[PDB]
Design an enzyme around this catalytic site. Sequence first.
Site, PDB file in Angstrom:
ATOM      1  N   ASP A   1       0.786  -1.188   0.000  1.00 22.64           N
ATOM      2  CA  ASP A   1       0.000   0.000   0.000  1.00 22.64           C
ATOM      3  C   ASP A   1       0.842   1.272   0.000  1.00 22.64           C
ATOM      4  OD1 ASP A   1      -2.324   1.395  -0.112  1.00 22.64           O
ATOM      5  OD2 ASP A   1      -2.534   1.520   2.107  1.00 22.64           O
TER       6      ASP A   1
ATOM      7  N   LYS B   1       2.083   4.741  -0.923  1.00 21.70           N
ATOM      8  CA  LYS B   1       1.352   5.947  -1.361  1.00 21.70           C
ATOM      9  C   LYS B   1       2.007   7.177  -0.716  1.00 21.70           C
ATOM     10  CE  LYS B   1      -1.985   4.995   2.131  1.00 21.70           C
ATOM     11  NZ  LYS B   1      -1.062   3.953   2.661  1.00 21.70           N
TER      12      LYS B   1
ATOM     13  N   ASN C   1       2.708   7.544   3.197  1.00 20.38           N
ATOM     14  CA  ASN C   1       3.704   6.721   3.869  1.00 20.38           C
ATOM     15  C   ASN C   1       5.106   7.337   3.805  1.00 20.38           C
ATOM     16  OD1 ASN C   1       1.803   4.465   2.234  1.00 20.38           O
ATOM     17  ND2 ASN C   1       2.022   4.125   4.412  1.00 20.38           N
TER      18      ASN C   1
ATOM     19  N   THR D   1      -4.635   0.858  -2.208  1.00 18.60           N
ATOM     20  CA  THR D   1      -5.289   2.143  -2.448  1.00 18.60           C
ATOM     21  C   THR D   1      -5.488   2.264  -3.964  1.00 18.60           C
ATOM     22  OG1 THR D   1      -4.185   3.044  -0.488  1.00 18.60           O
ATOM     23  CG2 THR D   1      -5.111   4.670  -2.048  1.00 18.60           C
TER      24      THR D   1
ATOM     25  N   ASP E   1       4.325   3.286   8.444  1.00 21.40           N
ATOM     26  CA  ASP E   1       3.073   2.539   8.385  1.00 21.40           C
ATOM     27  C   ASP E   1       3.073   1.368   7.394  1.00 21.40           C
ATOM     28  OD1 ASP E   1       0.321   1.656   8.359  1.00 21.40           O
ATOM     29  OD2 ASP E   1      -0.288   3.578   9.165  1.00 21.40           O
TER      30      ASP E   1
END
Lengths: 459, 459
Positions: A124, A126, A129, A165, A145
């Site tokens: 994930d 993005k 992060n 996402t 994260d």
Amino acid sequence: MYQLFEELGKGAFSVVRRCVKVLAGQEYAAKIINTKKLSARDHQKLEREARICRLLKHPNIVRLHDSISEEGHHYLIFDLVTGGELFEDIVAREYYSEADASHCIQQILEAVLHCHQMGVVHRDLKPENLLLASKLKGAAVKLADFGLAIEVEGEQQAWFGFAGTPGYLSPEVLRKDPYGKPVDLWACGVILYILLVGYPPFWDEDQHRLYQQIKAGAYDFPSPEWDTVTPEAKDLINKMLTINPSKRITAAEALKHPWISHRSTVASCMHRQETVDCLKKFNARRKLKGAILTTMLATRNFSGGKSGGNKKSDGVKESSESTNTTIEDEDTKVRKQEIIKVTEQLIEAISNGDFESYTKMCDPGMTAFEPEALGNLVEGLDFHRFYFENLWSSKPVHTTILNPHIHLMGDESACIAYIRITQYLDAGGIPRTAQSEETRVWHRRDGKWQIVHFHRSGA
Amino acid sequence: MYQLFEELGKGAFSVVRRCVKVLAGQEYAAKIINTKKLSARDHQKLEREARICRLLKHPNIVRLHDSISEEGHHYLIFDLVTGGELFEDIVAREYYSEADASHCIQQILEAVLHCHQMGVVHRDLKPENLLLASKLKGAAVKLADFGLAIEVEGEQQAWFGFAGTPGYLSPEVLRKDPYGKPVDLWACGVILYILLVGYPPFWDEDQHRLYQQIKAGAYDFPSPEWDTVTPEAKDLINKMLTINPSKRITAAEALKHPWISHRSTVASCMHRQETVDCLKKFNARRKLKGAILTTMLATRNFSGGKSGGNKKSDGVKESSESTNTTIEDEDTKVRKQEIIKVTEQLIEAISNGDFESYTKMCDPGMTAFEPEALGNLVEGLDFHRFYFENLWSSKPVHTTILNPHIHLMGDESACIAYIRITQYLDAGGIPRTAQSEETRVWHRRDGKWQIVHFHRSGA
């Protein structure tokens, strides 16, 4: 164990807050997950998240220090990084070039390589992060994260679930194919692309159409903004946004790409103001969309306008005397009487020959006019010490104060003038009497009245 | 012609604002209708509204003073009433009884009777139209806003359109029957009912069901709250909430009803706290439902409790004083020099024999010790006047100030001490010289330094 301070950021199921370890005096970020709002499965997979984050020790990855579960909450305590998002920081910079985006992506790829070598896939990746280590100039970019991260076995691919996402999802995840490490290189291609021109390669209001675009690899490099991007930056994006994960560039191979490893002769040095401008809007659209919205109405012009009544200049309204007396800070009382108090204490101190108390009530640089000075101006208390030591250290003597007048000159200044009459005895009295006219100038310094100057006549 | 000040209230298509007639100096309420947002028909019917409102001259009806159209707006200028809504006022009162509701309804019925006698039907009577004349105790209730009012011909009924507010709509309007004056008596029954118990007789989330309730006349008087309402109040409500408009009580007949005309022996005097409490919620639900300007929304409370409290910035000490620089004069000043200025002007004024300038620089109650007073304390300027008039009004004289010392005691107080030496000539000089030791105590009063006391020796 810990003390929570300000909030730093959010998700739908967690907040992050600065905290201090009580017994350590060290500060950390606490990821606070409301476990009552998770599925049984996502609660259970917090064990996997905790484990992955302990494994990962790298300069461009924030590490876990501790994990704690209570009845309704889980706490994942990480290093505190204080620079905020890379993406927010890029738009506040004075200069931003391909060479600067290359340094961002290199740091990200180094972190991702380390994950992949430890058998961790992020899944994930993005802009959210991508955090800066501190507010210092040239602070490192750090991955933060790993709540959707997975553990993989060597180079084996599997179906780990539909997670991610929308804009950063890889084609293989959307085709429901078994997957692995390459999903993170697709997401790096999307991030790199946004870092260069300030907008994403795939976007559609209709999520089903978005996914068809992703699966087709249907992104483009439109003029004017891509015309000044080097062919080598475009080549790296192409290699990452390759539909077939078996043919997609790996993190190790991306790091050897000339736009990264030969940055100094390959990556452009030209400031890209249009990227900075587009990225501002990108950043703003990211902070409206989310599970809970703080603003009451979503559709508000972001720019604003000036209303009426914003400045007011009134006219000289005719007024009367307005002395600004300060609010009193002690028991209410007569200031004149206060001066009388310190003055009586002064006369008693002189009469008793107590130079100690006389020193406290007098300023160190006290000015004095007196007949003992023979028309000269005397400064200090050295001069009166001769009279405290010799004469006053003692036959019956009675003092009488006549016609005292007090002038109050603000809260911190006063002046008293009076006639002093002294009854005494000389040698073998023979009672005698003497008159003098005395002026004392009192000044309150640090909550204490002190004589700054005094004047005596006919003594 | 007019000047607009604060907003007083709103509708969907109008705001009301206090205004002042420029050339009059009289204040009014301006109903400002945005004509761009009206249908052609509702724009045109503003002519009817303007006309109806000029007709109506009654103590319990707000009257129109003027009507103005511009390109996008129409302005209907009425009397200003400043008490706000009756309904808001009822909940802030210390006592509220049937006898008090009877006085409200009597005033409303008087206004409505006057409308009906002038061939005006209001059609949209509701709590929002019921304003108080002022904030004074016992201010009159006044009807405001006739935007849905119609003109009728005698007692003839017609179909004037489907218009009104759902909870107050009469059965005949809902049946699509020709109608007239009785529609307003139905609405008075609904208002009276709300005035007695604080909630409406007809309510449903589903508007179609609401209308079936209205058309059926399906309201009730439930215990406990109706048990203490007099049978005569219930009788008047029943007479007004009669489904057949030909059988409904008229405004003239309602005013003769004993609960109104024999209030003092019929209407209960008991305080109805439950009505006051329900009406608060009624009032609040009315102010969420509909507005045009953006309105803030409250958040439901969370279960149990969160910790928390007020926060104070912390530091090395309670307060702060910038970086830790060496303890020396940070920046220099000229206040000492200011004292020197006023002092030199004093000496020059004495030398020139100018008592006029000497008076300005001295306080009227100036204290003085000087050899010319022979050991006495002199107050005022009368004493030195003898020397200004006689001696100084004039052979060559030169003054010399030696060893001046200044004590600053706050912004408004100072004290200077110095040695004055005067060179002069006596009779047939023979040049002479004299010494004196002088102390001046200056005090700034209303931006001007004045002497409050002075001391002289050996002159």
